[PDB]
Amino acid sequence: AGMYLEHYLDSIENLPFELQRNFQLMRDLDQRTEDLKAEIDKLATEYMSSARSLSSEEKLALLKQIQEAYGKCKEFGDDKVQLAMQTYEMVDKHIRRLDTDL
Amino acid sequence: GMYLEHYLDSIENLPFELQRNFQLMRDLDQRTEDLKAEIDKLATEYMSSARSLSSEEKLALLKQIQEAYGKCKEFGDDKVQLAMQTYEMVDKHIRRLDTDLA
Numbered sequence: 001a002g003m004y005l006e007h008y009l010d011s012i013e014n015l016p017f018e019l020q021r022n023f024q025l026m027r028d029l030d031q032r033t034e035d036l037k038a039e040i041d042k043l044a045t046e047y048m049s050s051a052r053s054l055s056s057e058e059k060l061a062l063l064k065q066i067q068e069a070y071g072k073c074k075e076f077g078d079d080k081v082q083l084a085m086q087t088y089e090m091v092d093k094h095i096r097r098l099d100t101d102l
Numbered sequence: 103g104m105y106l107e108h109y110l111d112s113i114e115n116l117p118f119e120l121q122r123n124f125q126l127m128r129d130l131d132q133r134t135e136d137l138k139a140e141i142d143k144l145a146t147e148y149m150s151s152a153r154s155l156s157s158e159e160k161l162a163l164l165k166q167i168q169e170a171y172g173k174c175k176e177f178g179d180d181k182v183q184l185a186m187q188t189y190e191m192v193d194k195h196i197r198r199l200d201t202d203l204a
Contacts, residue, residue, distance in 0.1 A: 013152075015148075015152075016152055019148075019149075019167070020145065020149070023138075026138070040124065041124070044121060044124060047120075048121070056199045059195075060196060060200060063192050063196050063199065064196060066120070066192055067189055067192040067193060070188050070189045071185075071189055073185045074186050074189060077178060077181045078182060080178050081175055081179060084174050085175055087171050088171040088172055088175060091164050094160075094164055095161065095164050095165060098157050098160060098161040098164070102157055
């Protein structure tokens with residue numbers, strides 16, 4: 001399964017093209033975490049904007065927002081890590097080939 | 103990590119640890135941005151010369167792309183672990199503060 005695409009992507013001539021492809025997916029995932037991180041930063045600034053006590057409901061509402069943004073950040077991290085692994089493995093396969101050739 | 107965990111879970115330490123985690127996150131982002139710039143430069147290099155490249159030259163360049171991606175994935179694990187820790191720490195407070203959960 002995934003056989004034909006794999007054999008096609010196996011040829012080193014295709015490596016720089018697939019790399020560029022993966023670099024774009026990454027840049028896309030990066031834009032999303034940059035956005036979430038902007039949201040967290042605004043939340044942090046709200047939270048930090050005063051030293052006056054917050055009643056438990058007002059603090060709760062902030063924390064849920066902060067948490068939710070972090071939960072989405074973590075998922076995107078999962079996606080970047082996977083993609084990084086996959087790019088790493090692709091390049092590694094060619095490296096092992098050159099090594100045995102050398 | 104009992105004593106630190108107790109510290110991380112103390113109510114008064116929440117704002118400090120939250121902001122600290124955010125800065126940890128910013129540092130990690132700086133590291134991956136830098137690496138991605140390196141990777142883009144190497145890939146751009148590879149793409150523009152790969153037809154006339156010897157095995158040695160192709161290896162030296164792919165090895166750098168691989169190394170850079172390897173570091174990126176590990177910085178990626180760091181961000182993931184950091185987002186999860188932040189998520190879980192805030193979650194304790196959310197459960198405590200929510201009249202339903204506490």
